[PDB]
Design a protein around this ligand. Structure first.
Ligand SMILES: [Cl-]
Ligand SMILES: [Mg+2]
Ligand SMILES: [Mg+2]
Lengths: 415, 415
């Protein structure tokens, strides 16, 4: 099968590009917008529409493969590629990538994805979001040529011999940590709610007393609302380093506090994302490693989820090799080529580290379907409901795709 | 080309099944939940997860066509088919419909869609939502067999020789009619915000003064926040018959008031959905017809959009034949077979009536893509950003799909 044409369209995403720099300088609020001047190159307003580029690969047989380029909310922030405005990046795809794809015989997903993930233009690597979308489209093209699901392509090429099963779906609440929890319970999120505990005094409590109250509330809320008595989701709460802040990154003290949260969560299991956020990757690895060791040596039944300082494939391996937490967040948009997601999950698998196949609220329906397929193919421990902050829509996109893929896979197994 | 297999999976949607009757009886709010006993048969809580059924048609060539069965928020309410639980309806599809699809030759969309829209089981018509999803899947099957877009199939079979262009996207705010307006401005909704003006005293004002204030706020907000100075969206505000209520359905009083809204909206054009909501279809048609005649006679360039009492294709024809408003809402989930959407749009267009290709917050990403294609193919006056209440996601799904379809149609023109 040849690729005969490549088309690019600008588009929207599930969220916004936010000028993180301007917000951190103290941008004000006005309705759903921020006030004041922009700081970050490229921004015309502090909050602006998130953007995507749909990449279509027209195949020789007339099928159309489809992936979406997209970036995080804080596109163009510190350590990130420039603000992902479709107008700025469609030209690179049209001029530099299309000629390399047009007339290409579709081969395996891995070599083609690695090629396009690594290709340079004028000596420079491609924007992370371009690599994201192009490799999604390549994955879909291989699936379509082979007449199987994307999950099956990935399983064949990265996880051979394995079954493809449902993956627990993790929904994120943002600041609406009560109402969106209700949505999650009604939509039977397997893992919930994130809860955006991103401030010591307002959200954690100076002694952690506010998050303690919240965990108890959450436990009781699930019990009150759940349609099925056997609905027993896993708690996953991101504290944005605030536990570290509140207890001076004292290993014992953090563990003792986390123990009180586990105890408050019972009968539900507790995962804490980003317990501390310290000054460099080395010390983050160490503190995560050390807190896990404290929790495990004591048999405290709580899991730690890495995030801050654990960004790249190399970082994933680093956190994994060192048991720096119980679960590692695989940050799908930031990895560029989606083949990197599969390698990152398989690295975690090989080493018995939980893999959380993540994402951004600012990506698309299509990109979410694609990375969901990869999470399923690689037997990830959880996948993100995304994109958007509506919760309903992200759950729908991810879980419906999941169910459909399992149906097709199950059919194939029975032919 | 034949369909060789049919697979149904249960899924989620952009919103909830709500027991309207229980809510009208006074179910209380508790977080994102409603308190108290259910009233409508089928319901186990007043608010439960909205449900879909993904229908997959495996074609002989290995391609998989995909439509989603879905129903309105108030599934099982007065005049509606029963609560659309996947578990209640997957067996119907599997027993009564799948055997008719398996082995079925892909011919043209229209005759196939009509057959499945009209087919009976033990003498009874199928649930609207089943006909909705089945016929979507058929459309996608025809498109995939022909190697064209769904929009192209519909254009060929219902709008021969027409160009397929973008369609204005209409976004709805719910009760969050300020912050969701900010979202819509930033995402450049072509038509906005709906505003859910469903209460005289609290939302319209007893003398319409609250909506007048809101229209002024809306006007100023667009001008304040718009990135481009030439962003000039059309206002579309649904008043749920409350203008009729506030002004005792007096044609002149209603026209006078709507004139003050048009004057307040300037420089933006105003559409009012459902100005009155009277006692039967006949009197609804008459009031809409007469109120339009009064506005047109006066040269007040404010449009009326029909909704209440205009449901079926018959209703659409009736309202159209009588100029009962300027635009009619084509209620996608409720019409069953999606071929009926095309018939309804084309009727309006043949007869000088605006067609609003609508939908529900409680449908899916996939059904939204399919009906978007239909609205595009038939040159509807606007299409709903849907599903969900997040706004972002609905705009993303519909607009991105519209962009991609146009790129593919444009390429094909040139081939
Ligand atoms: Cl909340
Ligand atoms: Mg985090
Ligand atoms: Mg209405």
């Amino acid at each position: 099968m040849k690729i005969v044409d490549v088309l690019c369209t600008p588009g929207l995403t599930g969220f916004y590009f936010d000028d993180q720099r301007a917000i951190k300088k103290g941008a004000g609020h006005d309705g759903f917008t921020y006030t004041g001047s922009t700081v970050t190159e490229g921004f015309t307003q502090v909050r602006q529409k998130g953007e995507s580029i749909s990449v279509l690969l027209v195949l020789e047989d007339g099928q159309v493969a489809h992936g979406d380029c997209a970036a995080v909310q804080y596109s163009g922030a510190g350590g990130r590629d420039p603000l992902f405005l479709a107008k700025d990046f469609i030209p690179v795809i049209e001029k530099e990538i299309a000629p390399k794809l047009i007339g290409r015989e579709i081969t395996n997903f891995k070599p083609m994805a690695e090629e396009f993930d690594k290709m340079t233009v004028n000596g420079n690597r491609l924007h992370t979001a371009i690599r994201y979308g192009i490799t999604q489209a390549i994955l879909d093209a291989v699936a379509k040529t082979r007449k199987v699901t994307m999950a099956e392509v990935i399983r064949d090429e990265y996880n051979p011999g394995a079954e493809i099963n449902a993956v627990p779906v993790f929904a994120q609440s943002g600041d609406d940590r009560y109402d969106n929890v209700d949505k999650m319970i009604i939509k039977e999120a397997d893992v919930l709610p994130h809860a955006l505990i991103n401030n010591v005094e307002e959200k954690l409590g100076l002694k952690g007393e506010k998050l303690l109250e919240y965990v108890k509330w959450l436990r009781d809320r699930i019990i009150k609302l759940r349609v099925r008595e056997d609905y027993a989701p896993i708690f996953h709460i991101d504290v944005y380093g605030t536990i570290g802040a509140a207890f001076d990154v004292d290993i014992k003290a953090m563990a003792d506090y986390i123990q009180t949260l586990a105890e408050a969560a019972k009968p539900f299991h507790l995962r804490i994302e980003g317990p501390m956020d310290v000054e460099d990757r080395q010390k983050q690895m160490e503190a995560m490693r050390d807190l896990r060791a404290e929790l495990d040596g004591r048999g405290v039944d709580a899991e730690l989820v890495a995030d801050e300082w654990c960004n790249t494939v190399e970082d994933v391996k680093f956190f994994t090799d060192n048991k720096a937490g119980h679960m590692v967040q695989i940050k799908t948009p930031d990895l560029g080529g989606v083949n990197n997601i599969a390698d990152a999950i398989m690295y975690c698998k090989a080493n018995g580290m939980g893999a959380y196949c993540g994402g951004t609220c600012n990506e698309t329906n299509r990109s979410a379907e694609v990375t969901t397929n990869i999470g399923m193919a690689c037997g990830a421990r959880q996948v993100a409901a995304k994109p958007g902050m509506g919760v309903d829509e992200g759950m729908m996109i991810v879980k419906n795709e999941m169910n459909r893929v399992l149906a097709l896979v199950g059919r194939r197994k029975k032919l």
